[PDB]
Design a protein around this ligand. Structure first.
Ligand SMILES: Cc1cc2nc3c(=O)[nH]c(=O)nc-3n(C[C@H](O)[C@H](O)[C@H](O)COP(=O)(O)OP(=O)(O)OC[C@H]3O[C@@H](n4cnc5c(N)ncnc54)[C@H](O)[C@@H]3O)c2cc1C
Ligand code: SF4
Ligand code: SF4
Ligand code: SF4
Ligand code: SF4
Ligand code: SF4
Ligand code: FES
Lengths: 411, 137, 549
């Protein structure tokens, strides 16, 4: 109700409240915004087929958001780059977009680079504990769970285990055990630490809802005045119920978030030391990147790659026809993106040659971050090279205690 | 059989002037570094450095004006930030980051230019041939 | 209308059959998006798939029929053009029988249009002069692999090679062509699987291999004969397999025993030959990836080492065209009706007659593409070309032009104004993969759905519609098929296999593999499960002597 309130929210409409993963508050808020004409469209995820297929959808008929209700954990896609490419960057039309932590970070990166209009976009953020590739989820269920994947009705990551509901009953396996066996959440999701999107306008989740509402209420955190207005309007027009959250719920929400931070740190560690150190890391990187067939899927899918023509396409950098392409191709992406990589994983998961693009880029990003102190995707802070400052530059030269840029820079 | 290949990118207004002053004063140093001469060091893009290192520069040097003495009021702050980030990238791709450095040489420091030349040559000789030239194959 | 609508479709550019989403805004295809649900490619596409959407809405697309009226083509109505075509085809028929006509389709086309095209060519005027690109394209290997096994198709799938120990790429640029088939090689080497490449040149798919072997070009027979000689000599052949499921071993014995030292022919030293031969024969599950005698030698190797009917093994010759397998399946060859039902056998000849309500089917071996083009004036006159550009594709383009101008009433159906179009008398505009609604068939025998994204540009129509309207003009019964589903159901009634591949089953993202004889059958991703498809049910392995050119 005011920019910081933590609430329990569920839908007045019983059908919306049934089809919601929790209380249907994301689908009641989106429906209200559409039908009261705050927004001209709504960009949400719906199942196109079996629940393993997540299809983004622009919806203008308020009658079609009941189809968007429910959370697809196999939806590993990224929304904001689609709004720039096929919705003209939301420069003329207001939208309301449901987004995960990576989708909120991408919104802010593209708004920094002036590619979308966050004055027009409303971001309803969802908590995210991780996403699974659809085909990997299928193999998981066929092998480890011993079930025919077409039998599954719903499937969710709850309490750190992979619950599936099929005909016959339900099952559960620890996601950590699956991830050791070679399955589970995506690699970047294991390394992710953007669990509650507090940079969005509303943050909805199933964490901190305790007691009589454990499966029929959504924990709402109001993160901005725009979200406060949307929530107050929905509550007054009577599309959404609001009760103040339970302090014990707030506490255990904080504890689960903190534990997820620690797990993300552990995976960051084990992955980045798994890549190697010294000339071994150069042979890993160079031998992996020698596979690239120049499909440019990584460039076209990256949120940070907004350039009309990539420098990887310019003949004075990359020879046009030489297919065993140079390491310069990936050096040009390390130089341009690694300062602000939101670890969305799209580059890694769309690569036909299975190159760990996201692992390399995030390994560079984490310590560009601990060097310059710039966290990508949180707010309108300009990129590090788009805003250089006199005093800060003096400061980093004096901190080296040296007359040049040569040594005493790293530990 | 091996001679270091060091490439320098020196600004026109202090580092080129300093190198010219060293030459005029007849300060000797080994003939291992070849320079490019851009207007400011703000012109130096990261892709220039990375292109040099991937073509096989055993070392790269970028020389410019002291902080507060750029001909174009603040163009070497941008270069300094860029080269700090380049140092970080080379360390994390596993190439030895001491193959790269950025020195601030004024227009009157011909002696310091000679000393920079000597030290860059010595450091690259200690480091040895770059690994990219064999990792390519 | 619609803003950013996703439509799932198959890529039309090679035989992998990757799935992709076309983005359709206000009835215009505005981009290609990943489809992460697909088993074939998990949302991953090559440059061709990424930019497949560019050619759809080009201004150069044919929009209305054209008629050559004493010179440059003038604009015609559908009724006018079709009545002209029907009249001219009718007269050429009535003068020169079924030998006088000639049909050839492309492998770019959907299965329903290939099937209705061959049905048009046979149900009406009974001619088997029907054919497609696969002849002039790289591989007549289908005949050789058919002789070896029984089915010229690839024995296993693409995901299947993840189960081997010894992927053996042989003379293949699997990452230049079929990059998402070569993705399996990348995944396998990441899993730590022995990979041996044998191409004549150090290709980007030979980079991925643990061992790379040069040989002098045009020496596959000699190299494979040497490898089989060493396998036989040290006795790493599979005795149960050879004694139970294979025939011809003595003939192979004689033929290969003259290839102990073939360094003269192929450049490979005897040490490297023994290395690859023994690694292959010792691997428990080894898969060959190939890209006539050349493919039968591969069959010889697989049969000799017993590497055929099982997970993680087999022979996978890569096709190269998006629906070449589908066209051959539908029966756009001179000798096969559909599902490789030979026309030489009166049994299914009479079955075709009864099913199609037509009598006296030809039974003679038709004329292939080059056969037709060479006899294009002597006895063939009148030709329908469904999507070909022969003047640009065949060698001796000037000879092709001479033969085509020697021809009475060429009819050409295309989406673009090609070079072959100038020699046409009628030009019927067509639809591309974004306007059709049929199926493709991958090189791994998988039937994938093609979905309609937009409408054909102007007055252009899709091929089932054109051929049905032409057959209704000419008075042919059996072409009352208004949809690709009805065409598919007619084909399924005709063919013994593919009877289980209903569209309600093809709407699954997984698709269906071709030997699917019943409606509850899940498909046959691995062929020759425990018996082959020849007369005794046993593979025959042949003895080929190397012919120096
Ligand atoms: C992959 C994934 C993982 C999640 N993990 C957690 C977790 O660990 N803990 C937790 O507390 N919450 C998690 N959530 C959020 C959880 O589902 C929320 O409790 C829920 O969104 C509350 O909303 P609701 O039920 O009230 O409304 P709903 O009716 O469920 O609305 C859900 C909204 O999310 C949209 N959506 C569905 N799938 C996606 C997707 N893949 N990407 C983007 N938007 C999508 C739908 O279109 C809809 O608008 C996750 C969500 C997703 C998509
Ligand atoms: S990257 Fe982070 S926010 Fe995005 S889906 Fe994975 S875990 Fe959730
Ligand atoms: S997605 Fe992979 S294969 Fe394609 S250009 Fe990027 S790194 Fe290369
Ligand atoms: S480089 Fe890859 S992981 Fe990083 S932001 Fe871009 S797409 Fe996401
Ligand atoms: S890699 Fe650099 S040049 Fe290329 S699109 Fe991304 S930001 Fe632009
Ligand atoms: S691999 Fe073949 S089918 Fe797949 S996108 Fe590339 S060209 Fe198209
Ligand atoms: S003028 Fe030399 S650094 Fe700018």
């Amino acid at each position: 109700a005011a920019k910081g309130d933590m609430l329990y929210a569920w839908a007045k409409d019983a059908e919306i409240q049934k089809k919601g993963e929790c209380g249907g508050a994301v689908t009641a808020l989106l429906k209200h915004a559409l039908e009261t004409k705050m927004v001209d469209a709504v960009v949400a995820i719906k199942k196109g087929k079996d629940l393993y297929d997540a299809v983004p959808t622009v919806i203008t008929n308020p009658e079609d958001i009941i189809q968007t209700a429910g959370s697809l954990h196999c939806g590993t896609l990224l929304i904001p780059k689609l709004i720039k490419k096929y919705l003209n960057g939301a420069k003329d039309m207001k939208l309301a977009v449901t987004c995960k932590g990576c989708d909120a970070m991408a919104f802010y990166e593209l708004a920094k680079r002036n590619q979308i209009n966050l004055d027009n976009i409303i971001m309803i953020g969802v908590n995210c504990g991780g996403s699974v590739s659809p085909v990997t989820a299928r193999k998981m269920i066929s092998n480890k769970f011993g079930v025919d994947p077409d039998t599954v009705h719903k499937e969710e990551i709850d309490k750190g285990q992979f619950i599936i509901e099929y005909e016959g009953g339900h099952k559960g396996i620890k996601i950590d055990e699956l991830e050791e066996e070679g399955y589970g959440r995506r690699s970047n999701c294991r390394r992710c630490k953007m669990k509650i999107p507090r940079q969005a306008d509303i943050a909805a989740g199933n964490w901190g809802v305790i007691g009589d509402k454990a499966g029929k209420a959504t924990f709402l955190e109001i993160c901005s005045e725009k979200g406060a207005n949307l929530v107050n309007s929905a509550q007054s027009k009577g599309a959404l119920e609001i009760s103040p959250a339970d302090p014990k719920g707030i506490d255990i929400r904080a504890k689960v978030e903190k534990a997820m931070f620690n797990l993300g740190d552990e995976w960051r560690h084990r992955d980045f030391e798994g890549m190697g150190k010294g000339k071994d890391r150069l042979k890993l990187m160079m031998s992996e990147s020698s596979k690239c067939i120049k499909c440019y899927a990584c460039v076209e899918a990256c949120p940070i790659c907004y350039c009309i023509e990539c420098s990887t396409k310019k003949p004075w950098y990359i020879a046009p026809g030489v297919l065993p392409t140079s390491f310069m191709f990936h050096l040009i992406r390390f130089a341009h993106v690694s300062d602000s990589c939101i670890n969305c994983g799209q580059c890694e998961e769309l690569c036909p040659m299975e190159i760990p693009n996201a692992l390399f880029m995030h390994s560079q990003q984490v310590e560009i971050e601990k060097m310059f102190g710039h966290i990508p995707g949180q707010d309108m802070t300009p990129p590090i090279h788009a805003f250089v400052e006199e005093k800060a530059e003096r400061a980093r030269l004096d901190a080296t205690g040296t007359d040049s840029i040569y040594t005493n820079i790293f530990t | 059989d091996w001679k270091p290949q060091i490439l320098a990118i020196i600004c026109n207004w202090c580092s080129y002037a300093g190198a010219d002053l060293a030459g005029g004063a007849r300060i000797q140093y080994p003939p291992t570094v070849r320079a490019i001469r851009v207007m400011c060091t703000g012109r130096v893009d990261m892709l220039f450095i990375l292109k040099a290192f991937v073509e096989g520069a055993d070392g790269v040097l970028v020389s410019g004006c002291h902080f507060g003495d750029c001909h174009y009021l603040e163009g070497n702050y941008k270069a300094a930030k860029r080269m700090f980030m380049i140092k970080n990238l080379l360390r994390n791709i596993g190439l030895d980051d001491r193959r790269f450095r950025m020195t601030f040489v004024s227009a009157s420091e011909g002696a310091k230019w000679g000393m920079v030349m000597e030290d860059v040559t010595n450091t690259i000789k200690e480091l040895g041939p770059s690994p990219i030239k064999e990792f390519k194959k | 209308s619609e803003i950013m609508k996703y439509v799932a479709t198959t890529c039309p550019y090679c035989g992998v059959g990757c799935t992709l989403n076309l983005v359709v805004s206000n009835g215009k295809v505005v981009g290609v998006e990943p489809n992460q649900r697909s088993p074939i490619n998990e949302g991953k596409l090559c440059p061709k798939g990424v930019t497949c959407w560019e050619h759809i809405h080009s201004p150069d697309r044919l929009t209305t029929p054209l008629i050559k009226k004493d010179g440059k083509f003038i604009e015609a109505s559908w009724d006018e053009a079709l009545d002209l075509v029907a009249k001219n085809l009718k007269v050429i028929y009535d003068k020169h029988g079924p030998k006088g006509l000639g049909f050839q389709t492309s492998c770019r086309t959907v299965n329903e249009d290939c099937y209705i095209f061959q049905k048009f060519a046979r149900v009406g005027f009974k001619t088997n002069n029907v054919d497609n690109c696969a002849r002039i394209c790289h591989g007549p290997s289908v005949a050789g692999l058919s002789l070896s096994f029984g089915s010229g198709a690839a024995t296993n799938g693409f995901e299947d090679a993840l189960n081997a120990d010894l992927i053996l790429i042989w003379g293949s640029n699997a990452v230049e062509a079929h990059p998402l088939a070569g993705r399996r090689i990348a995944q396998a080497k990441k899993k730590g699987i022995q990979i041996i490449a044998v191409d004549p040149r150090y290709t980007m798919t030979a980079r991925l291999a643990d061992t790379y072997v040069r040989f002098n070009p045009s020496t596959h027979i000699a190299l494979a004969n040497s490898m089989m000689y060493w396998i036989i000599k040290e006795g790493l052949e599979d005795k149960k397999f050879i004694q139970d499921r294979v025939n011809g071993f003595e003939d192979l014995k004689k033929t290969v025993e003259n290839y102990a030292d073939a360094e003269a022919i192929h450049g490979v030293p005897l040490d490297v030959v023994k290395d690859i031969a023994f690694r292959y024969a010792k691997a428990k599950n080894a898969v060959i990836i190939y890209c006539t005698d050349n493919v039968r030698s591969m069959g010889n190797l697989a049969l000799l080492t017993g590497n055929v009917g099982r997970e993680g093994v087999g022979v996978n010759p890569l096709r190269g065209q998006n629906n070449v397998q589908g066209a051959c399946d539908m029966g756009a060859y001179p000798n096969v009706y559909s599902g490789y039902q030979k026309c030489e056998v009166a049994e299914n000849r009479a079955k075709m007659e009864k099913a199609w309500s037509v009598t006296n089917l030809p039974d003679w071996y038709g004329a292939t593409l080059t056969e037709q083009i060479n006899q294009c004036g002597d006895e063939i006159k009148g030709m329908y070309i469904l999507g070909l550009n022969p003047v640009v594709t065949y060698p001796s383009s000037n000879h092709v032009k001479a033969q085509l101008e020697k021809l009475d009433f060429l009819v050409v159906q295309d989406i673009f104004f090609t070079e072959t179009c100038q020699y046409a008398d009628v030009i019927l505009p067509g639809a591309c993969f974004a306007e059709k609604d049929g199926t493709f068939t991958s090189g791994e025998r998988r039937i994938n759905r093609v979905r309609k994204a937009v409408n054909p540009p102007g007055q252009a129509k899709e091929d089932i519609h054109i051929i049905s309207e032409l057959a209704a003009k000419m008075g042919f019964k059996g072409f009352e098929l208004p949809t690709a589903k009805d065409v598919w159901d007619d084909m399924r009634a005709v063919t013994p296999s593919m009877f289980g591949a209903t569209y309600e089953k093809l709407e699954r993202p997984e698709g269906i593999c071709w030997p699917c004889p019943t409606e509850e059958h899940p498909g046959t991703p691995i062929l020759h499960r425990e018996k082959f498809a020849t007369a005794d049910g046993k593979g025959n392995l042949f003895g080929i002597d190397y012919r120096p050119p």
